[PDB]
Amino acid sequence: SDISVAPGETARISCGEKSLGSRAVQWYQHRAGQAPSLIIYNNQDRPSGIPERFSGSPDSPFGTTATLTITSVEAGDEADYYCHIWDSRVPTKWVFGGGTTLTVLGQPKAAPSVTLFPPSSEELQANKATLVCLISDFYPGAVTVAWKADSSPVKAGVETTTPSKQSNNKYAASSYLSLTPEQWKSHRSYSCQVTHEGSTVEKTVAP
Amino acid sequence: QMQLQESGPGLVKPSETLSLTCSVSGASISDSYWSWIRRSPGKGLEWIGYVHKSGDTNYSPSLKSRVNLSLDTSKNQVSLSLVAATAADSGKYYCARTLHGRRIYGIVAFNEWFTYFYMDVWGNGTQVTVSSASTKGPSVFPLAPSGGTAALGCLVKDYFPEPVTVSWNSGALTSGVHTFPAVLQSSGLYSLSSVVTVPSSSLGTQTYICNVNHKPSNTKVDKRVEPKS
Numbered sequence: 416s417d418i419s420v421a422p423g424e425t426a427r428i429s430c431g432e433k434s435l436g437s438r439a440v441q442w443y444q445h446r447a448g449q450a451p452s453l454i455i456y457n458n459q460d461r462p463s464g465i466p467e468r469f470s471g472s473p474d475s476p477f478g479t480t481a482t483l484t485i486t487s488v489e490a491g492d493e494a495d496y497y498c499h500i501w502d503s504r505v506p507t508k509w510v511f512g513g514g515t516t517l518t519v520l521g522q523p524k525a526a527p528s529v530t531l532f533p534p535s536s537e538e539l540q541a542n543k544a545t546l547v548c549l550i551s552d553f554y555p556g557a558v559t560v561a562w563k564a565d566s567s568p569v570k571a572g573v574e575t576t577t578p579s580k581q582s583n584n585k586y587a588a589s590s591y592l593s594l595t596p597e598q599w600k601s602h603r604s605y606s607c608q609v610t611h612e613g614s615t616v617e618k619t620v621a622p
Numbered sequence: 623q624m625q626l627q628e629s630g631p632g633l634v635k636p637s638e639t640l641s642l643t644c645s646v647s648g649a650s651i652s653d654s655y656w657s658w659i660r661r662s663p664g665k666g667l668e669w670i671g672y673v674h675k676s677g678d679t680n681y682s683p684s685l686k687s688r689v690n691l692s693l694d695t696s697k698n699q700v701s702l703s704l705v706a707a708t709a710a711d712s713g714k715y716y717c718a719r720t721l722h723g724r725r726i727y728g729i730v731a732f733n734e735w736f737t738y739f740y741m742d743v744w745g746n747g748t749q750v751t752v753s754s755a756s757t758k759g760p761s762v763f764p765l766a767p768s769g770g771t772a773a774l775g776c777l778v779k780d781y782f783p784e785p786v787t788v789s790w791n792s793g794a795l796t797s798g799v800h801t802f803p804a805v806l807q808s809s810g811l812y813s814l815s816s817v818v819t820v821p822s823s824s825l826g827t828q829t830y831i832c833n834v835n836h837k838p839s840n841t842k843v844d845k846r847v848e849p850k851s
């Protein structure tokens with residue numbers, strides 16, 4: 416079950432069922448926007464490059480659970496953590512266990528960088544129109560986006576992504592407003608309002 | 623040093639065969655085992671099977687004998703075939719160099735040891751979607767630029783399925799590039815934007831082209847984007 420720890424404390428993740436025989440448990444780290452990487456093998460051996468502050472458990476005594484332990488937790492430790500358990504008394508396991516997310520509390524807030532583009536001459540020439548609102552490098556990841564035709568709120572025609580965590584632990588998102596060229600030109604301007612952590616940024620474009 | 627580039631059709635019709643290929647450089651395919659893992663939308667990782675030059679090869683029984691892993695020494699490639707594609711076969715597929723170890727917990731002669739596997743080098747994986755729906759290439763549009771910097775980009779509109787790649791100036795421009803995760807439209811089609819933050823002073827002098835590739839539809843497009851009137 417997911418966990419959140421403050422920097423410089425330690426996290427423990429427990430994966431799989433209790434052992435029966437001897438084991439050789441591997442641990443995998445899957446950072447956001449990255450391929451998974453091996454961080455522990457043969458219970459507690461470390462590929463070169465993995466800091467000592469990552470540790471797996473012994474397979475003695477039996478009947479215990481594979482537990483990954485990270486001390487001196489830091490922002491970069493935010494990832495999903497799986498295990499691959501091999502047990503001398505159990506048939507080989509093909510699905511990875513775990514996937515527990517580690518949230519590192521107390522990272523600094525980052526305000527969204529918001530960029531609003533009007534529809535292009537080419538798109539308008541293809542008798543279509545799309546406002547493009549880009550929202551990047553913000554933390555925490557919760558955001559809400561509202562569109563305005565002049566001063567009237569617009570919900571119809573809007574497609575807004577779910578925020579996705581980047582490699583640098585910040586989030587990105589984007590929102591689209593589909594117009595007809597005639598609608599785009601009818602209101603005097605359009606606005607993209609992004610609200611994040613009690614602040615609302617407004618970007619505006621006009622024909 | 624070692625790099626794994628897995629490639630596939632990026633669309634497969636139900637009850638048809640999925641064929642994926644993993645290109646290897648920096649390493650000989652003969653020196654180790656090779657695995658495929660598939661992550662489904664959301665979380666989870668499923669080890670699909672592993673292959674070796676000596677032919678020590680096994681497969682997850684959950685895949686109901688539908689998969690084949692092979693090696694081509696001349697092309698230094700690993701192959702994955704997935705017969706009878708179903709919706710539950712979608713997701714991102716990883717190629718990964720797999721190494722073996724030996725857990726010896728007792729007396730060897732009494733067989734008191736087993737072989738385990740770990741996967742130390744993973745590729746970035748390739749997206750696979752199962753659907754009777756037809757591929758649609760994206761339409762690409764320029765997003766012209768207006769603190770001492772300017773943002774310009776490309777709109778990649780109405781494509782299916784994922785994924786598309788965006789490079790700038792043929793790869794030469796990566797500093798300050800943000801390619802945004804696609805939006806899934808209620809139409810079932812995808813869009814995405816690629817934006818680059820540039821020094822304002824360069825708007826006239828330097829040229830900016832976005833290179834969009836949507837392989838499933840064989841769509842390759844270059845869009846030149848410059849400031850407008």
Ligand SMILES: CC(=O)N[C@@H]1[C@@H](O)[C@H](O)[C@@H](CO)O[C@H]1O
Nearest residue numbers: 448450624625626627744745746
């Ligand atoms: C072996 C391999 O594929 N390496 C690439 C790496 O070159 C690239 O910079 C990175 C982007 O996150 O994606 C990895 O998958």
